[PDB]
Design a protein around this motif. Structure first.
Motif, PDB file in Angstrom:
ATOM      1  N   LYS A 170      45.760  -9.961 -32.213  1.00  0.00           N
ATOM      2  CA  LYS A 170      45.844 -10.885 -33.338  1.00  0.00           C
ATOM      3  C   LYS A 170      47.298 -11.128 -33.783  1.00  0.00           C
ATOM      4  O   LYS A 170      47.574 -12.066 -34.535  1.00  0.00           O
ATOM      5  N   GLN A 219      49.060 -14.503 -32.580  1.00  0.00           N
ATOM      6  CA  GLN A 219      48.258 -15.506 -33.263  1.00  0.00           C
ATOM      7  C   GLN A 219      48.650 -15.679 -34.730  1.00  0.00           C
ATOM      8  O   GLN A 219      48.941 -16.787 -35.180  1.00  0.00           O
ATOM      9  N   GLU A 225      52.406 -16.819 -35.119  1.00  0.00           N
ATOM     10  CA  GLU A 225      52.601 -18.235 -34.805  1.00  0.00           C
ATOM     11  C   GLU A 225      51.968 -19.130 -35.893  1.00  0.00           C
ATOM     12  O   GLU A 225      52.572 -20.130 -36.318  1.00  0.00           O
ATOM     13  N   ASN A 226      50.778 -18.743 -36.366  1.00  0.00           N
ATOM     14  CA  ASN A 226      50.065 -19.486 -37.408  1.00  0.00           C
ATOM     15  C   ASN A 226      50.857 -19.567 -38.708  1.00  0.00           C
ATOM     16  O   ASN A 226      50.877 -20.612 -39.366  1.00  0.00           O
TER      17      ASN A 226
END
Length: 44
Positions: free
Chosen positions: A16, A19, A22-23
């Motif tokens: 995670k 993820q 980057e989010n």
């Protein structure tokens, strides 16, 4: 049992990781450009 629970948790969290980073990076980077477009639309 506790040790293995720890390890699986670390695995999921590391899956995670790219993820989430980057989010959030893309989103903060987007807030900079939306605050720059609201300050350049208030100044025209």
């Amino acid at each position: 049992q506790k040790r293995q629970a720890r390890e699986q948790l670390i695995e999921e969290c590391m899956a995670k990781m790219p993820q989430m980073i980057e989010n959030w990076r893309q989103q903060q980077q987007e807030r900079r450009x939306x605050x720059x477009x609201x300050x350049x639309x208030x100044x025209x």
